[PDB]
C-alpha cells in the first residue's frame, strides 16, 4: 500500500551537493572558535562514517533480502543516496572549509574513536548477521537501520542545525537539511518493513522482539551519551544534545510501531528554527483537400 508513494517521494527528492554553492559559509566558518570548528568537523566525520556503512552495507544487504522489484528499487535508490550523495556531500563541505591536513586528521580520528567504532561494530554486525530466508535476522537488522536513520544521526545533525538556526553556516546547513529530509523518509520506510515482519510473529515472539529492540536502543543510547559528551563538552552543549537524541530515539521507536521510551523535554528553540515532436505517418488522405 505504500512502496509506490515512497518510490515517487524518493526520486522527486533527488539532489547533488554541487547544486549548493558553499563559498558563502567561508566567513561564518572563519569566525568560529577553534573548539567550535573541531566539534563541527568531528560531528560531520561521524555522520560520514554512518552514511558510508549505510550505503556500502546496510541498504544493499536489506535490498537483497526484501522481496519485490519495487521494494528493491526503493531500497537501491536509498542506498545510492547514502554513499553517492550523502557521504560525498560531507567531503564537499570539508574541502571548502578546511585545509587538507585538518581533513586527513579528522578521518584518522574516526578510525581511532572508540564510540564511533563501537556503534559501527554493532550496527554493521547486525547487517552481516542477516540469514537468507530468515525473517527474524532481517527484522533485527531493520531495527538497527531505523536506529541509525532516526536516532544515531542526530547527535551529529544537532550542530549544523544549531548554527543554521542562528543564521550561521547556512549553505552547509542547507545540505544537512536535505540529508535530514532523506533520512526521515528512509527511517519511516524501513520501519514499515520491520513492522511487517514483527506482525507475522506469535505474541511470545513479539515480546522477545520488543526486548531486542529496547535492549539494543539502550545499548546504543549509553554509547551515544559518551560520544556526545566527548564532542560537545568543549562547546558547552552536551546536555542540550542529549535531550535532542532522546527526542529522536522516540521517533525511531515510533517508526517501528512502538511506544515512546523517554519523557518529553524542551529542545533548544534555535535547533527548531534550524528545521523532438510527436511523429505520425502521412496518410493518403492528407494529400487531398
Amino acid at each position: 500500500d505504500f512502496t509506490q508513494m515512497f518510490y515517487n517521494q524518493n526520486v522527486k527528492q533527488f539532489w547533488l551537493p554541487e547544486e549548493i554553492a558553499l563559498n558563502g559559509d567561508l566567513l561564518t566558518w572563519k569566525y568560529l572558535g577553534k573548539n567550535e570548528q573541531d566539534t563541527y568537523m568531528k560531528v560531520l566525520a561521524g555522520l560520514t562514517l554512518l552514511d558510508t556503512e549505510q550505503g556500502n552495507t546496510g541498504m544493499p544487504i536489506v535490498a537483497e533480502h526484501v522481496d519485490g522489484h519495487q521494494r528493491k528499487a526503493v531500497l537501491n535508490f536509498m542506498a545510492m543516496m547514502e554513499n553517492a550523495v550523502h557521504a560525498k556531500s560531507y567531503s564537499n563541505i570539508f574541502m571548502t572549509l578546511a585545509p587538507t591536513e585538518t581533513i586527513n586528521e579528522v578521518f584518522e580520528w574516526v578510525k581511532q574513536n572508540k564510540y564511533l567504532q563501537k556503534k559501527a561494530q554493532m550496527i554493521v554486525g547486525l547487517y552481516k548477521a542477516i540469514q537468507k530466508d530468515d525473517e527474524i535476522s532481517l527484522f533485527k537488522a531493520m531495527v538497527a537501520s531505523v536506529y541509525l536513520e532516526s536516532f544515531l544521526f542526530y547527535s551529529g545533525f544537532y550542530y549544523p542545525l544549531y548554527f543554521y538556526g542562528q543564521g550561521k553556516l547556512m549553505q552547509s546547513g542547507e545540505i544537512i537539511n536535505l540529508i535530514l529530509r532523506d533520512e526521515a523518509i528512509h527511517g519511516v520506510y524501513v520501519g514499515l518493513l520491520a513492522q511487517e515482519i514483527y506482525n507475522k510473529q506469535t505474541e511470545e515472539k513479539k515480546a522477545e522482539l520488543r526486548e531486542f529492540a529496547i535492549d539494543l536502543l539502550n545499548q546504543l543510547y549509553e554509547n551515544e551519551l559518551e560520544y556526545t559528551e566527548d564532542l560537545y563538552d568543549q562547546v558547552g552543549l552536551s546536555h542540550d544534545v542529549k535531550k535532542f537524541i532522546r527526542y529522536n530515539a522516540n521517533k525511531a521507536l515510533m517508526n517501528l510501531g512502538f511506544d515512546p521510551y523517554f519523557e518529553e523535554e524542551d529542545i533548544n528553540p534555535i535547533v527548531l528554527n534550524g528545521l523532438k515532436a510527436t511523429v505520425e505517418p502521412l496518410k493518403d488522405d492528407d494529400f487531398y483537400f
Binding site: 523532438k276 515532436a277 510527436t278 511523429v279 505520425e280 505517418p281 502521412l282 496518410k283 493518403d284 492528407d286 494529400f287 487531398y288 483537400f289
Partner: protein, 683 residues
C-alpha cells in the same frame, strides 16, 4: 529602474480587470521627457546641424549637395509640421536604439525621427525638393517604410549597402565555390543576408576529373559557407546570416537536412547557415501516390544532358532521368522525406520550403530563368542565371544574381489615408532610386542583375493590425476579401508605376520582351476576374478610393504592351522585423504571435502591446498560434495571387500538433498555391 520603464510595466498591472494600455502612451512621454530630449544634440539652426553631420563624416555630401539649403530646410519643416508622436514606448525605443543616428561615442542622439525621415526623403528624391516633400509626407504619415538597410543607412557616410537580400547561384566548380564564398563574405561585410543555391553542385561521391568518389557534396560547401558567414559578421556587430537552398531531388538532400539535426556531429552541423529545400511538384506527386522517388547525382545529369538538374523541368525530366542508365540515382521514400522535413521544422524551424512549380506557374520571367531558390527570408523569388567563374587571367561569364530592394506599405496607415495609389507609386519610385544607386564592386552577378532586372520588392505590413482595429478576424472570409482587393490594387498601381517609369526613361528591364507582361498573359486573370470586394464591410473600408476594375486592368495591359515595364519584379512581402516597431505595426502580413510581448533589454523588462490593442479589439487580435493554419494559408495564398515574388510565410504551431499536422499544412500550402514557407515556430 527608469520612470518610462515603470510606466511601461504598469500596463500588465490590471485596473478594473483591464490592462492599462493608455499608460504606455504616458511612458512614451516619459521616454521623451527624461531620456530622449536630454540626450538629443541640439543646434542653433539646421545649417549648423547639417554642417556638423557632414563634416564629422555622419552624412554624405553628394545627396545633400543636390539641394539648396532652403529646399532642405523646407523638407525638414514639412517633416516637423506633422508633429509626429510615437504612440507606444517600444516604437520610440526601437527607433532611437536601432535607427536614430548617434555620435561616435554612442551617448548622444544626433537624429530625431523627423531628421531621419527628412534625410531619407532627400536621398530618395535625388535633387527634387517637391519629391522630397512628398516622401517626407509619405514617411511621416507612416504610410510607407523603407527597409531597415534603406531607413538606417540612407544619407549616411558610415553605412552598409541599402540592399540586404542577396541570392547567389553557385556553379559546380572549385573556382565557382571559392568565388561564392568570397562574394558571400563581401556581401555579409556590406551587411546583407546572402542566400546561395547549391543544387548545381554535384553530390557526395561524384567524380572530379574522372576520379571516382571524390566530391565532398554540398555539405562541405555548406561548412565552408558557414565559416565564411561566421567570419564576416558586420565588423562584429550582428551574427553573420546566410542561407543555403538545395533541390529536394539533389542526392545530398538528406545530408543537407542532416546539417540541422541536433544529433549531427560537429563536422556535419552548420549553425549560422539557414537551409531551404526546393520542392518541385514532381516530389509532391510522388509522395502523394506513395511511389518511391529517386534523388539524382547532378553531375551525371549534367554530363548526360549538358544542363544542370535544377535548370530543367523535373516534371518532364524525372522519368527520363530514372530511365537513363547514365544518370546515377538513389532510391528514397518521398513520404519519409516529407516526414523528415516536418520533424526538422518542428525541432528547429528548418528548412524553408520552396514549392518550385507554385512559384514558376505564375512567374513572369520564366524565359530568363525559372526561380530555382529563394532568399534568407524565403520571399524573394526571381529568375537567376548561374555565372561561370573561370581560372585567373581568364574572362568570367557573369550571370544574374538576385538582389531585390525592400520596402513595406503600412496597410492601416495607407488605407486610412485612402492613398493606395500614391503610396504605392512613391514607394516604387524610392525603391527604383535605391536600386539605381546600389553599386556593389565585389559581386559581379549581383551588380549585373541589379542593372538589368531592376527588380524591387514592395511589401506590406500591419495587415493583422488593420483588420483587428476594424473588427475583422484574420481568419474570416472578410479578411481574405480585403487582402485580395488591397493587394490587387497594390499590384495594379505597382505595374502602372513600373510602366510609367519605363515610358519616362524609355527603357524596360532586360529580356522584358519575353516576359508575360509583354505578351499580356500576366494580365489574363486581371482582365477576366473582378477583384472588387464581395463583402459590404470591405467595400465600405475601400470607400473614397477607386478600385481598379477589369476595364482598368485592360487599359493597364495595353499601357504595358505599348510602353513596357521598368521592373522585372515589384512586390515581395518581407518579414519586416524591427521596422514594424517604429511604425507601430504588426510584422508583415503575418498574424500576431502575442497580444502583448514581453522583452528583456539590459536588466530591465518591457511590455509591447500590439498596435491599437484595447478591450474592444482584444478578441480580434487573435494570436497566431491559436489560429487555424489552413485559414492563414488561405489568406497568404489570397495575397500571393497578387504578389509576383513570394511572401515570408511563417507557420505558427502548437506543441500539441505533430509532424503529420505540419506536413498537412505544407501540403495544403502547396495545394493553395503558396510559393514559400518560412518558419515553423512552435509555441
Amino acid at each position: 529602474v527608469p520612470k518610462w520603464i515603470q510606466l511601461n510595466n504598469e500596463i500588465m498591472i490590471q485596473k478594473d480587470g483591464k490592462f492599462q494600455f493608455d499608460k504606455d502612451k504616458e511612458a512614451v512621454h516619459s521616454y521623451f521627457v527624461d531620456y530622449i530630449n536630454q540626450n538629443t544634440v541640439f543646434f542653433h539652426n539646421l545649417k549648423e546641424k547639417l554642417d556638423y553631420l557632414v563634416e564629422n563624416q555622419y552624412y554624405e555630401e553628394e545627396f545633400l549637395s543636390l539641394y539648396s539649403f532652403e529646399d532642405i530646410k523646407e523638407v525638414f519643416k514639412t517633416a516637423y509640421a506633422k508633429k509626429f508622436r510615437f504612440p507606444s514606448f517600444m516604437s520610440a525605443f526601437k527607433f532611437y536604439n536601432d535607427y536614430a543616428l548617434k555620435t561616435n561615442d554612442k551617448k548622444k542622439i544626433l537624429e530625431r525621427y523627423e531628421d531621419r525621415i527628412s534625410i531619407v526623403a532627400l536621398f530618395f528624391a535625388n535633387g527634387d525638393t517637391e519629391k522630397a516633400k512628398e516622401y517626407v509626407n509619405l514617411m511621416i504619415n507612416q504610410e510607407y517604410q523603407p527597409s531597415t538597410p534603406t531607413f538606417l543607412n540612407a544619407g549616411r557616410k558610415r553605412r552598409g549597402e541599402l540592399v540586404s537580400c542577396f541570392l547567389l547561384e553557385v556553379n559546380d566548380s572549385l573556382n565557382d565555390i571559392s568565388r561564392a564564398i568570397d562574394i558571400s563574405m563581401q556581401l555579409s561585410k556590406l551587411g546583407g543576408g546572402v542566400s546561395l543555391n547549391l543544387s548545381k553542385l554535384r553530390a557526395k561521391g561524384e567524380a572530379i576529373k574522372d576520379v571516382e568518389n571524390a566530391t565532398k557534396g554540398v555539405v562541405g560547401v555548406m561548412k565552408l559557407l558557414d565559416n565564411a558567414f561566421r567570419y564576416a559578421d558586420q565588423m562584429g556587430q550582428r551574427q553573420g546570416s546566410g542561407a543555403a537552398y538545395l533541390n529536394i531531388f539533389h542526392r545530398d538532400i538528406n545530408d543537407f537536412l542532416d546539417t540541422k539535426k541536433i544529433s549531427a556531429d560537429e563536422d556535419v552541423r552548420v549553425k549560422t547557415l539557414s537551409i531551404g529545400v526546393v520542392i518541385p511538384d514532381k516530389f509532391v506527386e510522388l509522395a502523394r501516390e506513395d511511389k518511391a522517388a529517386y534523388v539524382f547525382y547532378p553531375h551525371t545529369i549534367y554530363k548526360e544532358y549538358g544542363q544542370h538538374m535544377d535548370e530543367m523541368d523535373m516534371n518532364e525530366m524525372y522519368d527520363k532521368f530514372v530511365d537513363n542508365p547514365r544518370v546515377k540515382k538513389e532510391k528514397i521514400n518521398p513520404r519519409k522525406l516529407l516526414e523528415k522535413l516536418a520533424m526538422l521544422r518542428s525541432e528547429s524551424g528548418y528548412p524553408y520550403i520552396m514549392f518550385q512549380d507554385n512559384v514558376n506557374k505564375v512567374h513572369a520571367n520564366n524565359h530568363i530563368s525559372k526561380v530555382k531558390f529563394s532568399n534568407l527570408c524565403s520571399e524573394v523569388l526571381q529568375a537567376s542565371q548561374v555565372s561561370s567563374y573561370t581560372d585567373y587571367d581568364e574572362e568570367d561569364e557573369i550571370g544574374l544574381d538576385i538582389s531585390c530592394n525592400l520596402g513595406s506599405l503600412n496597410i492601416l496607415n495607407v488605407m486610412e489615408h485612402k492613398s493606395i495609389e500614391k503610396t504605392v507609386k512613391l514607394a516604387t519610385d524610392s525603391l527604383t532610386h535605391v536600386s539605381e544607386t546600389t553599386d556593389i564592386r565585389n559581386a559581379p552577378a549581383v551588380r549585373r542583375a541589379n542593372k538589368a532586372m531592376k527588380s524591387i520588392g514592395l511589401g506590406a505590413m500591419n495587415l493583422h493590425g488593420y483588420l483587428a482595429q476594424n473588427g475583422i478576424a484574420y481568419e474570416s472570409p472578410e479578411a481574405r476579401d480585403f487582402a485580395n482587393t488591397f493587394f490587387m490594387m497594390v499590384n495594379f498601381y505597382s505595374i502602372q508605376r513600373s510602366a510609367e517609369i519605363a515610358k519616362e526613361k524609355g527603357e524596360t528591364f532586360d529580356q522584358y520582351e519575353g516576359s508575360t507582361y509583354a505578351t499580356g498573359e500576366y494580365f489574363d486573370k486581371y482582365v477576366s476576374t473582378d477583384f472588387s470586394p464581395k463583402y459590404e464591410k470591405i467595400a465600405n473600408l475601400f470607400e473614397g478610393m477607386h478600385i481598379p476594375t477589369t476595364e482598368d486592368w485592360k487599359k493597364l495591359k495595353a499601357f504595358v504592351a505599348e510602353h513596357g515595364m521598368y521592373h522585372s519584379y515589384r512586390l515581395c512581402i518581407a518579414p519586416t522585423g524591427s521596422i514594424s516597431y517604429v511604425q507601430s505595426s504588426t510584422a508583415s502580413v503575418m498574424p500576431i504571435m502575442e497580444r502583448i510581448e514581453e522583452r528583456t533589454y539590459g536588466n530591465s523588462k518591457t511590455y509591447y502591446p500590439m498596435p491599437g490593442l484595447a478591450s474592444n479589439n482584444w478578441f480580434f487580435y487573435k494570436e497566431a498560434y491559436d489560429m487555424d493554419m489552413f485559414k492563414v494559408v488561405d489568406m497568404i495564398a489570397t495575397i500571393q495571387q497578387h504578389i509576383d515574388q513570394g511572401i515570408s510565410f511563417t507557420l505558427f504551431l502548437k506543441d500539441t500538433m505533430t509532424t503529420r499536422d505540419l506536413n498537412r499544412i505544407d501540403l495544403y500550402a502547396h495545394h493553395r498555391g503558396i510559393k514559400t514557407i518560412y518558419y515553423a515556430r512552435t509555441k
